[PDB]
Design an enzyme around this catalytic site. Structure first.
Site, mmCIF file in Angstrom:
data_model
loop_
_atom_site.group_PDB
_atom_site.id
_atom_site.type_symbol
_atom_site.label_atom_id
_atom_site.label_comp_id
_atom_site.label_asym_id
_atom_site.label_seq_id
_atom_site.Cartn_x
_atom_site.Cartn_y
_atom_site.Cartn_z
ATOM 1 N N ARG A 1 1.196 -0.785 -0.348
ATOM 2 C CA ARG A 1 0.003 -0.041 0.255
ATOM 3 C C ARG A 1 1.409 1.408 -0.111
ATOM 4 O O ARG A 1 1.887 1.288 0.905
ATOM 5 C CB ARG A 1 -0.884 0.163 1.502
ATOM 6 C CG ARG A 1 -1.314 1.185 1.283
ATOM 7 C CD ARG A 1 -3.036 1.584 2.700
ATOM 8 N NE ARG A 1 -3.428 -0.060 2.672
ATOM 9 C CZ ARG A 1 -3.732 -0.965 3.300
ATOM 10 N NH1 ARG A 1 -2.698 -0.738 4.311
ATOM 11 N NH2 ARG A 1 -4.714 -2.072 3.599
ATOM 12 N N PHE B 1 1.938 10.565 1.426
ATOM 13 C CA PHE B 1 1.445 10.552 2.814
ATOM 14 C C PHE B 1 2.453 9.389 3.018
ATOM 15 O O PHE B 1 3.111 9.707 4.287
ATOM 16 C CB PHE B 1 -0.230 9.350 2.806
ATOM 17 C CG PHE B 1 -0.986 8.972 4.089
ATOM 18 C CD1 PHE B 1 0.263 9.400 4.937
ATOM 19 C CD2 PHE B 1 -1.970 7.794 3.837
ATOM 20 C CE1 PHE B 1 -0.298 8.442 6.449
ATOM 21 C CE2 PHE B 1 -2.233 7.481 5.299
ATOM 22 C CZ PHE B 1 -1.928 7.440 6.122
ATOM 23 N N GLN C 1 3.915 1.453 2.862
ATOM 24 C CA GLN C 1 3.118 0.785 3.597
ATOM 25 C C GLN C 1 4.217 -0.728 3.351
ATOM 26 O O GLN C 1 3.340 -1.070 2.366
ATOM 27 C CB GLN C 1 1.982 0.738 4.201
ATOM 28 C CG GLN C 1 2.012 -0.521 5.317
ATOM 29 C CD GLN C 1 0.468 -0.683 4.959
ATOM 30 O OE1 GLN C 1 -0.623 0.709 5.162
ATOM 31 N NE2 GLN C 1 -0.370 -1.596 6.484
ATOM 32 N N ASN D 1 -1.402 -0.956 12.929
ATOM 33 C CA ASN D 1 -1.843 -1.207 13.293
ATOM 34 C C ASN D 1 -3.482 -1.547 13.296
ATOM 35 O O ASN D 1 -3.634 -1.661 12.230
ATOM 36 C CB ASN D 1 -1.667 -0.879 15.196
ATOM 37 C CG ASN D 1 -2.617 -0.134 15.081
ATOM 38 O OD1 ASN D 1 -3.527 0.575 14.734
ATOM 39 N ND2 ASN D 1 -1.809 1.262 15.694
ATOM 40 N N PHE E 1 5.165 1.444 7.996
ATOM 41 C CA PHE E 1 5.242 2.476 6.991
ATOM 42 C C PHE E 1 6.099 2.960 7.108
ATOM 43 O O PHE E 1 6.848 3.334 8.063
ATOM 44 C CB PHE E 1 3.518 2.866 7.000
ATOM 45 C CG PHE E 1 2.912 3.432 8.385
ATOM 46 C CD1 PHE E 1 2.858 3.282 9.723
ATOM 47 C CD2 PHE E 1 3.428 5.241 8.393
ATOM 48 C CE1 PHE E 1 2.480 4.002 10.122
ATOM 49 C CE2 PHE E 1 2.703 6.019 9.552
ATOM 50 C CZ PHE E 1 2.212 4.975 10.542
ATOM 51 N N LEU F 1 -1.602 10.825 13.332
ATOM 52 C CA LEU F 1 -1.449 9.196 13.829
ATOM 53 C C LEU F 1 -0.433 9.212 14.751
ATOM 54 O O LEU F 1 -0.440 8.616 15.554
ATOM 55 C CB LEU F 1 -0.594 9.052 12.833
ATOM 56 C CG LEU F 1 -1.196 8.698 11.666
ATOM 57 C CD1 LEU F 1 -0.009 7.850 10.259
ATOM 58 C CD2 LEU F 1 -2.219 8.131 11.698
ATOM 59 N N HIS G 1 -0.092 5.751 16.872
ATOM 60 C CA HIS G 1 0.628 4.616 15.720
ATOM 61 C C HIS G 1 2.128 4.819 16.362
ATOM 62 O O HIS G 1 2.476 5.943 16.833
ATOM 63 C CB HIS G 1 0.494 4.473 13.928
ATOM 64 C CG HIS G 1 -0.515 4.326 13.640
ATOM 65 N ND1 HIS G 1 -0.624 2.670 13.303
ATOM 66 C CD2 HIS G 1 -1.173 5.049 13.335
ATOM 67 C CE1 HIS G 1 -1.966 3.273 12.720
ATOM 68 N NE2 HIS G 1 -2.737 4.811 12.706
#
Lengths: 164, 164, 164
Positions: C54, C59, C62, C101, C112, C121, C125
């Site tokens: 991903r 952003f 991942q 997660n 990531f 985040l 995370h």
């Protein structure tokens, strides 16, 4: 006369335009009728909302697996598979529309549009039509292919049908 | 006609209201039937008691992991996963109902309701319905989300089923 | 000193280069140890031969699902999941290395690398490292992503391990 059908195609949700195809019912009526009915969906299944799952630049753009979207599936209006009708028409150049197969007499719903002359498929894949408008749309599809056949953008037939 | 289903949604035990969805069984019958049967719970399992576990404002509200309750699980009425039926329907705007997935041909039970047009998901997630009543309830759910997807309250589907 | 580890990354079989990561064992020793051991493969499993499944431009990138290659799997060296060790380190900008997660205390092996400050985040995370070489490689990976997270090329970790 020979049926005219169309495919409207997106790449990653953005429109590429419309491909219009003449189906050579005067030469391969059974093969043409299968593709015609799959474009209209009149049998309850067909190409609308399916994908071009294999695109190889300088070769062809392949679609028509509306059951599995991966090249293993699809079906004809006659059953899972139907025989090779004849080999009259040749893969003469870009825009030729032809049946994908698994060897002789395995025609289903999968098909390809050539982007070059592929005479090495003559006598192996049944040719049944050609692009009459929107070849530039086919070239757009081709531009997202790769040697592996995987596409860099997802190519979706957003609409299709018969023009009559 | 197309099935209508409903989700009754709570937030920390406080009822938010009912969302009514039309399932486009005329376009994606297999995907609509999965969602319909998961709303009624007629197979012994379904959405009742599961949560909206991921809510991203100005994007979508995601629910339907009735096994792991965290976005890793779920299951369909056809097995763990079923193929993408078609991509005929698009994420045209708020209220579209679509399948969450883990890539092509991985549909299970998780789903999302869009709160904006997400055309960048067209071709990747199977759209199969839309909100016809209770979009204000969807907006209430959305207001408890965050950019991280984590909700500020526990958003539960306290009841669900089919309207007939 | 804090461990240095590396990921060598291909896109469609072409080498992009090496990402070198410093693991903040001085702040999150249990989380750093998990990632370190998954890079070396010393437990008999780990990141070698897995993918960036991903990638979302502007952003993050991942990776880390070495069991299912689709974002549903992976496991830690401690078990399927281990708790959030602390949230001392923040998502301060590009190059931050952080744990994916499925909600609180569900870290496994997925991780990531941020390509922007993702402060939304923080506290959700666990940040445990940062890029010290090869941010240009991370930007290359980023360039093959999309808003849907799907990649336009297959991004493979062809090698990984510990440098010091």
């Amino acid at each position: 006369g020979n049926p005219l059908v169309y495919l409207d195609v997106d790449a990653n949700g953005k429109p590429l335009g419309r491909v219009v195809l003449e189906l050579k019912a005067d030469v391969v009526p059974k093969t043409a009728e299968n593709f015609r009915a799959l474009c209209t969906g009149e049998k309850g299944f067909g190409y609308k909302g399916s994908t071009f799952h294999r695109v190889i630049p300088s070769f062809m753009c392949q679609a028509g697996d509306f059951t599995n979207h991966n090249g293993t599936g699809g079906k004809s209006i006659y059953g899972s598979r139907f025989p090779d009708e004849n080999f009259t028409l040749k893969h003469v150049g870009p825009g030729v529309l032809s049946m994908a197969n698994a060897g002789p007499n395995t025609n289903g719903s999968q098909f390809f549009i050539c982007t070059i002359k592929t005479d090495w498929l003559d006598g192996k894949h049944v040719v049944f039509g050609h692009v009459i408008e929107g070849m530039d749309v086919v070239k757009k599809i081709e531009s997202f292919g790769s040697k592996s056949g995987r596409t860099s953008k997802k190519i979706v037939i957003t609409d299709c049908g018969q023009l009559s």
